[PDB]
Design a protein around this ligand. Structure first.
Ligand SMILES: *[C@@H]1O[C@H](CO)[C@@H](O)[C@H](O)[C@H]1NC(C)=O
Lengths: 49, 48
C-alpha cells in the first residue's frame, strides 16, 4: 500500500478488500455561562418622644 | 456490494472543511427604592 498520511509503506492482504488514506475528522462544542445575583436590603427607624 | 457500480475515470481530489458557531448573551437589571417618613406633634396648654 502506498504511503498515505502514515508510515513509509504498508502491506495489505487478500482477505482485506481496501485501505483508505482519506483523513476526515469532526468536532462539536457546547459551552455555557450564567450568573444569578440577588440583593435585598430593608431599613426602618421610628422615634417617639 | 463489495466493488460497486461505477469507477473513477476522471475527477478531482482535495480537502474541505466547515465551521459553525452560535453565540448568545442576556443582561438584566432591576432596582427598587421606597422611602416614607411621617412626623406628627401636638401641644395644648390652658391656665385659669
Ligand atoms: C457573575 O457573572 C459573570 C459573567 O461572566 C462571571 O464572570 C462571574 O464569575 C459571576 N459571579 C458570580 C457567579 O459570583
Amino acid at each position: 500500500v502506498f504511503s498515505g498520511d502514515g508510515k513509509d509503506f504498508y502491506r495489505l492482504s487478500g482477505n482485506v478488500l481496501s485501505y483508505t488514506f482519506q483523513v476526515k475528522i469532526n468536532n462539536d462544542f457546547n459551552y455555557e455561562f450564567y450568573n444569578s445575583t440577588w440583593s435585598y436590603v430593608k431599613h426602618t427607624s421610628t422615634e417617639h418622644t | 456490494d463489495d466493488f460497486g457500480t461505477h469507477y473513477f475515470t476522471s475527477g478531482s481530489l482535495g480537502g474541505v472543511y466547515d465551521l459553525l458557531y452560535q453565540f448568545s448573551s442576556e443582561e438584566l437589571k432591576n432596582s427598587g427604592l421606597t422611602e416614607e417618613e411621617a412626623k406628627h406633634c401636638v401641644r395644648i396648654e390652658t391656665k385659669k
